[PDB]
């Protein structure tokens, strides 16, 4: 065991996508957010069918032990793409084994296939594993982010 | 004059989109990035046709004096959407007149129409106007961001 295989999920792999989401739940400690109100199978299908969403999964045999959810941003200034890693998680029982790194690597192959010139991801202050991983793999910038409630539309 | 009208651009408005991009160029001081290698009309059409890209523009009569480029992120954990402001600019000759605010407001109407529960935007340290605008309009978080070269795929 410990034969890890990485792939980009298609619309035929809703079962594996749901397992990625539970992984996300367990590992982000948001079991409710990620497992208890999942979309219907059509919704996931439509995600997985799309050219601008990428779901990557790592399998130790049958179980999903790593996943990565990204979005492709076709840019408007020029005919070029950027990729935005939204979420990335490896099973606690499978860390420091290169799975995250391999999913990013896989992601780079998808990017190359798409002609996307860059991939980016955001990390939180204190998320030290994530910060190390992306610092090893990327160029860091510190920035601000703001949420806005659309409720207040006038 | 100074009658400003805000709208979400459709695929019939490639001419106005190109003007948004020049605005972006002039105002971000990236005239090359934004004006000199624009996509072909089809590419823009396809952007403007899409349900997951939003281009908002403000017009003082015929000229574009404000624009906003966002992406809709249909989420995977749950059947819900988030909106990501990528770029936002108001003509230097038209600032502090509520145009940015009105484009965001417009954006909130689009979000509501989409069922999207939040909108977010990133700002740079020292971009004081932007920081004030989003601080007035949003809840700030400080975070890191990392670019990764897909070139190194192995
Ligand atoms: C971060 C996470 C994905 C790491 O996955 P991983 O497979 O263990 O990472 P890899 O083993 O492929 O590579 C780890 C590399 O990143 C860094 N790193 C990973 N875990 C680390 C840790 N615990 N402490 C310090 N650095 C760490 C190191 O550079 C390491 O390279 P090295 O072992 O040669 O020094 C996982 O532990 C996790 O908690 N996921 C959720 C975190 C997250 O970012 N969520 C929000 C979405 S981005
Ligand atoms: C930031 C920018 C969009 C402002 O547009 P604007 O129409 O002038 O903003 P509005 O007039 O609608 O509202 C401005 C509000 O934000 C803040 N603000 C705007 N300009 C400001 C400035 N120069 N200094 C301080 N605060 C400022 C204030 O809260 C103000 O509210 P108030 O006048 O009641 O105090 C524009 O000046 C610009 O430079 N665009 C590019 C910046 C950018 O963010 N680019 C990267 C993509 S996010
Ligand atoms: C509340 N505001 C939000 C803002 O936090 C941001 O969320 C980022 C998101 O991509 C990823 O979140 C995951 O990671 C972690 C640990 N870091 C916990 C929860 C996970 N989902 C991650 N790459 C970094 C996040 N900052 O954008 C969306 C938002 C709504 O604005
Ligand atoms: C180089 N790394 C990049 C990283 O900077 C980030 O760019 C953000 C982008 O949305 C918007 O940029 C605009 O604003 C400004 C002034 N702030 C200058 C150039 C404009 N295009 C803005 N909201 C904040 C940016 N930080 O993401 C993409 C990226 C490739 O990773």
Numbering used by the authors:
A (entry chain A), B (entry chain A): 24 to 177
What did the published study say regarding this structure?
The primary mode of resistance to aminoglycoside antibiotics is through chemical modification catalyzed by aminoglycoside-modifying enzymes. Here we present the first structural and functional studies of two aminoglycoside-modifying enzymes that do not use target mimicry, AAC(3)-Ia and AAC(3)-XIa. X-ray diffraction studies reveal that these enzymes bind aminoglycoside antibiotics in a conformation where the central 2-deoxystreptamine ring is in boat conformation. Similar to other AACs, AAC(3)-Ia and AAC(3)-XIa display the GNAT superfamily fold.
We have determined two crystal structures of AAC(3)-Ia from Acinetobacter baumannii and five of AAC(3)-XIa from C. striatum, in complex with various aminoglycosides and either CoASH or AcCoA, as well as a structure where one of two active sites contains AcCoA. Both AAC(3)-Ia structures only contain a single protomer per asymmetric unit. In the AAC(3)-Ia structure, sisomicin is present in both antibiotic binding sites of the dimer. The experimental maps of the antibiotics in all AAC(3)-Ia and AAC(3)-XIa ternary complex structures presented in this report unambiguously place the aminoglycosides’ central ring in a boat conformation rather than the canonical chair conformation. Additionally, in all of these aminoglycosides the N-3, O-4 and O-5 atoms of the central ring were positioned in an axial plane rather than an equatorial plane, positioning the prime ring of aminoglycoside around 90° to the central ring. In the AAC(3)-Ia and AAC(3)-XIa complexes, regions of the adjacent protomer in the swapped dimer contribute to the aminoglycoside binding sites. In both structures, the C-terminal swapped dimer tail from the adjacent protomer makes direct contact with the aminoglycoside. A glutamic acid residue forms a hydrogen bond with N-3” in AAC(3)-Ia and N-3” in and N-1 in AAC(3)-XIa. In AAC(3)-Ia, the aminoglycoside site is opened and easy for ligands to access, whereas in AAC(3)-XIa, the aminoglycoside binding site is closed off and the enzyme would require a conformational shift to accept reactants and release products. Whereas AAC(3)-IIIa only made contacts with the central ring and the double prime ring, leaving the prime ring solvent exposed. In total, the boat-binder AAC(3)-Ia made 16 hydrogen bonds with sisomicin, and AAC(3)-XIa made 17 hydrogen bonds with acetylated sisomicin, while AAC(3)-IIIa only made 7 hydrogen bonds with sisomicin.
